[PDB]
Design an enzyme around this catalytic site. Structure first.
Site, PDB file in Angstrom:
ATOM      1  N   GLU A 170       0.828  -1.108  -0.077  1.00 12.35           N
ATOM      2  CA  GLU A 170      -0.056  -0.249   0.015  1.00 12.35           C
ATOM      3  C   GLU A 170       0.819   1.314   0.035  1.00 12.35           C
ATOM      4  O   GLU A 170       0.358   2.084   0.646  1.00 12.35           O
ATOM      5  CB  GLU A 170      -1.014   0.000   1.239  1.00 12.35           C
ATOM      6  CG  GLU A 170      -1.994  -1.170   1.101  1.00 12.35           C
ATOM      7  CD  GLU A 170      -3.135  -1.209   1.906  1.00 12.35           C
ATOM      8  OE1 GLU A 170      -3.253  -0.763   3.069  1.00 12.35           O
ATOM      9  OE2 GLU A 170      -4.422  -1.611   1.507  1.00 12.35           O
ATOM     10  N   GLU A 278      -6.192  -7.123  -2.108  1.00 14.48           N
ATOM     11  CA  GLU A 278      -7.098  -7.088  -0.718  1.00 14.48           C
ATOM     12  C   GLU A 278      -8.387  -6.681  -0.865  1.00 14.48           C
ATOM     13  O   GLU A 278      -8.542  -5.761  -1.676  1.00 14.48           O
ATOM     14  CB  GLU A 278      -6.317  -6.085   0.245  1.00 14.48           C
ATOM     15  CG  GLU A 278      -4.738  -6.225   0.671  1.00 14.48           C
ATOM     16  CD  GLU A 278      -4.469  -5.444   1.590  1.00 14.48           C
ATOM     17  OE1 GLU A 278      -5.219  -4.769   2.591  1.00 14.48           O
ATOM     18  OE2 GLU A 278      -3.178  -5.071   2.051  1.00 14.48           O
TER      19      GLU A 278
END
Length: 353
Positions: A170, A278
């Site tokens: 991320e 995710e």
């Protein structure tokens, strides 16, 4: 030529001469928990027909449960690396593939901010631009790629149980509205990995945000320093990653449907696979329907794959590892059955390819 390493062909992955459509998951504790706990998650994956798991390849600075990987710059510790070796070994034994990011955007397990602290920099985003930090990241990557796995004598860069390296979990550059900083860093670091490892795929690990010019109301699309179309188009990036947490982001499940469709479509236009790496939905009374709907888009629109957050198993005393974050999936469960029915269809699509 057929390869035991996962490769790409257009918008899908290949493996051993066949297309490789998959469902998978994530778990952050493989590098510090027992073999019993790790093995239990692998066993859940087999029962759920899952083929890929994304696990952390980092444990920077402070130990977790007496385990660490890089306590200080360039000091590489066997306590965490032996556990990562075991995960790679066990994946190879069980026919599962791993996706491994090298650093966390976030502070869990040290992250980019641990590098900022070590190198006396003045904020998170210095990680991407300061030469001292970039070289420390490169030294860590090069150590990992070249490490001999203590369980089998195979260097990580040579092990086909690893599907892909990932630049970061991320990564964001909130101080850079242009998206240039992360694109430049990702170009440099993907080129670096490929200069060492000519077997494995590389992905960024970003959340998939678009660069929308001007000042969009939804600040995630521009304001986090992430330009997913440019990141995915980089020469040494093999597939695009996108994450999905509509609750967190102030969005709905139906917005999530459109987010999946948009990223799959953009993979078709760029010509590379994309993975919903995710995803999670917090209302457990609706998540089975929400996940079913998201995964059916993946299946029907020919997305390459997806990985839910988070599969956890038993603890050493046999009880369930707790639902600390509200996203826990356990096997068996009604959410696990939604996912495993979809996984079976992805595996059948692969076998029929």
């Amino acid at each position: 030529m057929a390869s035991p390493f996962v490769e790409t062909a257009g918008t899908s992955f290949t493996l051993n001469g066949k297309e490789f459509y998959f469902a998978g998951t994530n778990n952050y504790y493989f590098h510090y928990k027992s073999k019993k706990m790790v093995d239990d998650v692998f066993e859940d994956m087999k029962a759920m027909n899952l083929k890929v798991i994304r696990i952390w390849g980092f444990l920077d600075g402070q130990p977790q449960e007496n385990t660490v990987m890089q306590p200080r710059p360039g000091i590489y510790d066997e306590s965490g690396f032996s556990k990562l070796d075991y995960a790679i070994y066990k994946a190879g034994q069980t026919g599962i593939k791993l996706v491994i990011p090298f650093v966390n955007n976030w502070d869990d397990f040290g992250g980019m901010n641990q590098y900022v602290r070590w190198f006396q920099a003045d904020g998170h985003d210095a990680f991407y631009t300061h030469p001292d930090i970039k070289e420390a990241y490169k030294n860590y990557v090069s150590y990992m790629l070249n490490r001999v796995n203590t369980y089998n004598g195979v260097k990580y860069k040579d092990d086909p149980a690893i599907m892909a390296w990932e630049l970061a979990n991320e990564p964001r550059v909130q101080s850079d509205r242009t998206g240039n900083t992360l694109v430049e860093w990702a170009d440099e670091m993907s080129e670096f990995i490929k200069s060492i490892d000519q077997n494995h795929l590389v992905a960024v690990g970003d959340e998939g945000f678009y660069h929308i010019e001007g000042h969009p109301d939804w600040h995630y699309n521009g304001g986090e320093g992430v330009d997913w179309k440019r990141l995915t188009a980089l020469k040494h990036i093999d597939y695009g990653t996108y994450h999905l947490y509509p609750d967190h982001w102030g969005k709905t499940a139906e917005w999530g449907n459109q987010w999946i469709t948009d990223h799959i479509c953009d993979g078709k236009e760029i010509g590379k696979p994309v993975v919903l790496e995710e995803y999670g939905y917090q209302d457990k009374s609706r998540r089975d329907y929400v996940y079913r709907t998201w995964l059916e888009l993946i299946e029907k629109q020919s997305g390459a794959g997806s990985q839910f957050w988070i599969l956890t198993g038993i603890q050493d005393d046999g009880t369930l590892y707790p639902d600390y974050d509200g996203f826990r999936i356990v096997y068996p469960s009604s959410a696990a059955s939604v996912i495993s029915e979809h996984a079976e269809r992805m595996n059948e699509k692969s076998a029929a390819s």
